[PDB]
Short mmCIF file of C-alpha atoms and ligand atoms in Angstrom, two decimals:
data_model
loop_
_atom_site.label_atom_id
_atom_site.label_comp_id
_atom_site.label_asym_id
_atom_site.label_seq_id
_atom_site.Cartn_x
_atom_site.Cartn_y
_atom_site.Cartn_z
CA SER A 1 -96.92 -19.06 -62.43
CA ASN A 2 -94.11 -20.54 -64.63
CA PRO A 3 -95.15 -21.19 -67.96
CA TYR A 4 -91.82 -23.50 -67.99
CA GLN A 5 -93.02 -26.08 -65.45
CA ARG A 6 -93.67 -29.78 -66.50
CA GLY A 7 -94.56 -32.78 -64.83
CA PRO A 8 -95.46 -33.44 -61.21
CA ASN A 9 -94.00 -32.03 -57.89
CA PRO A 10 -90.54 -34.20 -57.79
CA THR A 11 -89.22 -36.55 -55.04
CA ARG A 12 -85.75 -37.98 -55.15
CA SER A 13 -86.55 -41.33 -55.98
CA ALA A 14 -88.63 -40.33 -59.04
CA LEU A 15 -85.13 -38.33 -59.99
CA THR A 16 -83.48 -41.95 -60.38
CA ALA A 17 -85.37 -43.41 -62.80
CA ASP A 18 -87.00 -42.38 -66.07
CA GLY A 19 -89.50 -39.77 -65.69
CA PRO A 20 -93.14 -39.08 -66.87
CA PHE A 21 -92.81 -38.34 -70.35
CA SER A 22 -92.91 -41.20 -72.86
CA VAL A 23 -89.52 -40.98 -74.91
CA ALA A 24 -89.07 -41.12 -78.85
CA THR A 25 -85.94 -41.41 -80.62
CA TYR A 26 -84.56 -40.11 -84.00
CA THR A 27 -81.03 -41.27 -85.39
CA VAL A 28 -78.98 -38.26 -86.91
CA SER A 29 -77.21 -39.92 -89.31
CA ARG A 30 -73.39 -39.07 -89.63
CA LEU A 31 -73.37 -37.88 -93.04
CA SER A 32 -76.77 -36.11 -92.99
CA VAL A 33 -75.15 -33.04 -91.10
CA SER A 34 -72.27 -30.71 -91.34
CA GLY A 35 -70.24 -29.55 -87.99
CA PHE A 36 -70.54 -32.62 -86.25
CA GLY A 37 -70.95 -36.59 -86.65
CA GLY A 38 -75.02 -36.87 -86.24
CA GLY A 39 -76.04 -38.96 -83.19
CA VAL A 40 -79.58 -39.49 -81.41
CA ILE A 41 -82.36 -36.95 -80.32
CA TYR A 42 -84.17 -38.43 -77.37
CA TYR A 43 -87.80 -36.35 -77.05
CA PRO A 44 -90.73 -36.45 -75.41
CA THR A 45 -94.09 -37.58 -77.38
CA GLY A 46 -97.78 -38.18 -76.75
CA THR A 47 -97.82 -34.47 -75.82
CA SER A 48 -98.74 -31.29 -76.68
CA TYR A 49 -96.34 -29.23 -74.82
CA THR A 50 -92.76 -27.77 -75.72
CA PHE A 51 -89.40 -28.43 -73.83
CA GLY A 52 -86.21 -26.52 -73.73
CA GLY A 53 -82.87 -28.67 -75.42
CA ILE A 54 -79.66 -29.87 -74.34
CA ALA A 55 -77.01 -30.99 -76.41
CA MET A 56 -74.52 -33.56 -74.89
CA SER A 57 -71.07 -34.18 -75.98
CA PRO A 58 -69.65 -38.20 -75.04
CA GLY A 59 -66.12 -38.64 -74.01
CA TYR A 60 -62.51 -39.01 -75.96
CA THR A 61 -63.04 -42.09 -77.67
CA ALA A 62 -66.41 -42.60 -77.06
CA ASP A 63 -69.46 -42.76 -78.93
CA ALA A 64 -72.94 -41.18 -78.18
CA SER A 65 -74.04 -44.60 -76.79
CA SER A 66 -71.70 -44.12 -73.97
CA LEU A 67 -74.54 -41.60 -72.54
CA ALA A 68 -77.53 -43.20 -73.99
CA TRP A 69 -79.19 -44.01 -70.46
CA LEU A 70 -78.49 -40.23 -69.64
CA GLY A 71 -80.51 -38.60 -72.76
CA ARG A 72 -83.18 -40.79 -72.33
CA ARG A 73 -83.58 -40.33 -68.55
CA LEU A 74 -83.36 -36.36 -69.39
CA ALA A 75 -85.81 -36.65 -72.32
CA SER A 76 -87.98 -38.70 -70.26
CA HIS A 77 -88.31 -35.80 -67.28
CA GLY A 78 -89.27 -33.16 -70.20
CA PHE A 79 -86.12 -32.02 -72.63
CA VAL A 80 -85.14 -32.67 -76.06
CA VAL A 81 -81.35 -34.18 -75.99
CA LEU A 82 -79.42 -34.44 -78.64
CA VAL A 83 -76.11 -36.65 -77.94
CA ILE A 84 -73.79 -36.19 -80.40
CA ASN A 85 -71.54 -38.22 -81.95
CA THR A 86 -68.22 -36.49 -83.14
CA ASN A 87 -66.54 -36.25 -86.44
CA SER A 88 -63.49 -38.02 -84.77
CA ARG A 89 -63.33 -40.29 -81.79
CA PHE A 90 -60.31 -38.62 -80.96
CA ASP A 91 -61.65 -34.95 -80.97
CA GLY A 92 -60.36 -32.40 -78.34
CA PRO A 93 -62.38 -30.33 -75.48
CA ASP A 94 -62.66 -27.50 -77.96
CA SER A 95 -63.57 -29.30 -80.82
CA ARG A 96 -66.30 -31.42 -79.14
CA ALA A 97 -67.13 -27.42 -78.05
CA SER A 98 -67.66 -26.32 -82.13
CA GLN A 99 -69.61 -29.49 -82.42
CA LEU A 100 -72.36 -28.63 -79.44
CA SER A 101 -72.59 -25.33 -80.97
CA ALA A 102 -73.27 -27.20 -84.48
CA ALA A 103 -75.37 -29.63 -82.85
CA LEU A 104 -77.62 -26.66 -81.00
CA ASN A 105 -78.03 -25.15 -84.19
CA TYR A 106 -79.17 -28.38 -85.90
CA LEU A 107 -81.82 -28.93 -82.77
CA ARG A 108 -83.48 -25.21 -83.76
CA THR A 109 -83.11 -25.59 -87.53
CA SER A 110 -82.70 -28.61 -89.60
CA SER A 111 -83.89 -31.31 -86.96
CA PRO A 112 -87.33 -32.97 -88.02
CA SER A 113 -90.47 -31.42 -87.41
CA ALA A 114 -91.39 -33.49 -84.88
CA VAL A 115 -88.31 -32.84 -82.90
CA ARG A 116 -88.87 -28.85 -83.48
CA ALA A 117 -92.68 -29.24 -82.30
CA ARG A 118 -91.65 -30.42 -79.42
CA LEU A 119 -88.61 -27.58 -78.52
CA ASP A 120 -88.82 -24.23 -77.31
CA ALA A 121 -85.26 -23.34 -78.90
CA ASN A 122 -85.13 -19.99 -76.58
CA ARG A 123 -84.16 -22.44 -74.25
CA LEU A 124 -81.19 -24.42 -74.55
CA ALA A 125 -78.08 -26.37 -72.64
CA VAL A 126 -75.16 -28.25 -72.51
CA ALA A 127 -73.71 -31.61 -70.87
CA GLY A 128 -70.84 -33.81 -71.49
CA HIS A 129 -68.74 -36.20 -70.31
CA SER A 130 -64.67 -36.14 -69.98
CA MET A 131 -63.41 -34.13 -72.75
CA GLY A 132 -66.89 -33.59 -73.82
CA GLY A 133 -67.15 -31.89 -70.40
CA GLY A 134 -64.54 -29.43 -71.37
CA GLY A 135 -66.13 -28.88 -74.53
CA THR A 136 -69.00 -27.82 -72.26
CA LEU A 137 -67.22 -25.34 -70.43
CA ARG A 138 -65.91 -24.00 -73.42
CA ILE A 139 -69.16 -23.52 -75.00
CA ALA A 140 -70.42 -21.99 -71.94
CA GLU A 141 -67.89 -19.35 -72.04
CA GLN A 142 -68.28 -19.05 -76.16
CA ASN A 143 -72.33 -18.49 -75.77
CA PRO A 144 -73.76 -17.01 -72.11
CA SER A 145 -77.31 -17.12 -73.92
CA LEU A 146 -76.83 -21.20 -72.73
CA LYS A 147 -79.49 -21.76 -69.85
CA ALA A 148 -77.08 -23.98 -68.03
CA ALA A 149 -74.01 -26.34 -68.38
CA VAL A 150 -73.35 -29.67 -66.70
CA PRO A 151 -70.00 -30.64 -66.94
CA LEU A 152 -69.38 -34.44 -65.92
CA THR A 153 -65.64 -35.85 -64.88
CA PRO A 154 -64.75 -32.88 -66.88
CA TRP A 155 -61.21 -32.42 -68.66
CA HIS A 156 -59.56 -29.64 -70.10
CA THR A 157 -56.44 -28.19 -70.39
CA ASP A 158 -57.25 -24.51 -69.83
CA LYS A 159 -58.54 -24.22 -66.10
CA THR A 160 -60.82 -21.10 -66.23
CA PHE A 161 -63.70 -20.03 -67.79
CA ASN A 162 -65.37 -16.70 -67.76
CA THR A 163 -69.04 -17.63 -68.10
CA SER A 164 -72.01 -16.39 -67.13
CA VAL A 165 -73.99 -19.61 -67.45
CA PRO A 166 -74.94 -21.42 -64.26
CA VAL A 167 -72.58 -24.42 -64.15
CA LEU A 168 -72.87 -27.98 -61.87
CA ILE A 169 -69.96 -29.89 -61.90
CA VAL A 170 -69.92 -33.64 -61.49
CA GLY A 171 -66.37 -35.05 -60.17
CA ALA A 172 -65.48 -38.58 -59.22
CA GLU A 173 -63.43 -39.17 -56.59
CA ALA A 174 -61.16 -42.08 -57.76
CA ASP A 175 -60.88 -40.68 -61.03
CA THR A 176 -57.64 -41.25 -62.52
CA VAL A 177 -58.44 -39.88 -66.34
CA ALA A 178 -59.13 -36.12 -64.86
CA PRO A 179 -58.26 -36.22 -61.58
CA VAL A 180 -60.26 -33.82 -59.44
CA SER A 181 -57.55 -31.74 -57.94
CA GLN A 182 -56.21 -30.56 -61.71
CA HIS A 183 -59.60 -30.80 -63.58
CA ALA A 184 -62.97 -30.34 -62.02
CA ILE A 185 -62.06 -28.46 -58.41
CA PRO A 186 -59.96 -26.14 -60.31
CA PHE A 187 -62.62 -25.63 -63.01
CA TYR A 188 -65.01 -25.06 -60.46
CA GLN A 189 -62.99 -22.52 -58.32
CA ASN A 190 -61.79 -20.55 -61.39
CA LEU A 191 -65.40 -19.92 -62.68
CA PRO A 192 -66.61 -16.34 -61.79
CA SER A 193 -67.92 -15.94 -58.24
CA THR A 194 -70.73 -14.07 -59.64
CA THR A 195 -72.05 -17.27 -61.62
CA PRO A 196 -74.45 -19.66 -59.85
CA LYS A 197 -71.97 -22.67 -59.70
CA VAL A 198 -72.19 -26.14 -57.71
CA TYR A 199 -69.61 -28.93 -57.73
CA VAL A 200 -70.49 -32.63 -56.67
CA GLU A 201 -67.92 -35.23 -55.95
CA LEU A 202 -69.35 -38.99 -56.43
CA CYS A 203 -67.61 -41.15 -53.71
CA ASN A 204 -65.07 -44.14 -54.63
CA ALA A 205 -66.75 -43.40 -58.47
CA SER A 206 -64.18 -43.80 -61.67
CA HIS A 207 -64.00 -41.58 -64.58
CA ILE A 208 -66.74 -44.13 -66.09
CA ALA A 209 -69.34 -43.54 -63.55
CA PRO A 210 -71.54 -40.86 -66.11
CA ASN A 211 -71.49 -44.04 -68.55
CA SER A 212 -74.19 -46.00 -66.66
CA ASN A 213 -77.12 -45.36 -64.92
CA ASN A 214 -75.83 -43.55 -62.05
CA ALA A 215 -78.37 -41.82 -59.56
CA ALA A 216 -76.18 -39.23 -58.15
CA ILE A 217 -75.68 -37.97 -61.72
CA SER A 218 -79.29 -38.48 -62.60
CA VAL A 219 -80.58 -36.33 -59.40
CA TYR A 220 -78.05 -33.32 -59.96
CA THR A 221 -78.20 -33.05 -63.87
CA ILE A 222 -82.46 -33.35 -64.02
CA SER A 223 -82.53 -31.02 -61.11
CA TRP A 224 -80.06 -28.32 -62.23
CA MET A 225 -81.67 -28.23 -65.97
CA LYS A 226 -84.94 -27.99 -64.52
CA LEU A 227 -83.74 -25.28 -61.89
CA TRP A 228 -82.47 -23.37 -65.15
CA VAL A 229 -83.56 -24.00 -68.29
CA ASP A 230 -87.67 -24.32 -66.92
CA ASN A 231 -86.95 -21.62 -64.18
CA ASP A 232 -88.33 -24.55 -62.26
CA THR A 233 -87.75 -23.91 -58.29
CA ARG A 234 -89.02 -27.18 -57.20
CA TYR A 235 -85.90 -28.69 -57.94
CA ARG A 236 -83.93 -26.41 -55.42
CA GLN A 237 -84.63 -29.11 -52.71
CA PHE A 238 -82.21 -31.21 -54.44
CA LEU A 239 -79.41 -28.77 -54.44
CA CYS A 240 -80.02 -26.78 -51.44
CA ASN A 241 -79.39 -27.92 -47.74
CA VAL A 242 -77.53 -30.89 -48.92
CA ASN A 243 -76.57 -34.09 -46.90
CA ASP A 244 -76.10 -36.81 -49.43
CA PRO A 245 -74.13 -39.74 -48.25
CA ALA A 246 -73.27 -40.06 -52.37
CA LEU A 247 -70.95 -37.22 -52.10
CA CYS A 248 -67.88 -36.88 -50.73
CA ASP A 249 -67.36 -33.46 -51.70
CA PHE A 250 -70.05 -30.87 -51.90
CA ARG A 251 -69.43 -26.87 -53.02
CA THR A 252 -71.36 -24.00 -54.26
CA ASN A 253 -71.49 -20.04 -54.00
CA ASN A 254 -75.45 -20.60 -53.23
CA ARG A 255 -76.96 -18.22 -55.64
CA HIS A 256 -79.29 -20.71 -56.34
CA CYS A 257 -81.07 -21.13 -53.39
CL1 CL B 1 -70.80 -35.16 -90.24
#
């Protein structure tokens, strides 16, 4: 049962470190692509399986290197992950959405044969930090064929996204760049009632929590991607009946349980 199932039965511990798949990397040069600034693809190797794909945007003034740990973490659990660079480090959230859109098309159509061999392009998702997280919300509204969206400490001036794509938002309690009261929480609350949604708030965390190895971000991001991109109900346990001392808030409409 479940053709998209990959990897062993998960434990919490295992989701806080790199997973069972060997990871290859491919550098997408800036000038090689139109529509975004290149980036790095992290993808499984030493395996004959295909996997869902994820495009991920860094935040305002940041490089793809700021999410390298997470691109590799996700790939090692069984995903093809393209972390983009943006045309300009100064690009806003809606520009980042357009670039995510270009990056997804690139992954499907134009990426190296070794990457395409590992990709099931029928199953794609998005994630992003800060302004990249605002871009993640925007693209989830523009393209409801996506399987999931994970905005990390998101920032956007638009607060309402009418998307049917399942969304998990990570807020940071002590974020002064994108305060959760103005950004993450409004975004959560304003998503449709009928859309599966989760909000987790990291205790004592700042806006840069996403930029280094973070156990909570790892567990929640892997679990949401597995649940929605792979239909992998083994990951429900991490997202349901949650009692996590790393969290200082948790909200859900419990559609995923
Ligand atoms: Cl380019």
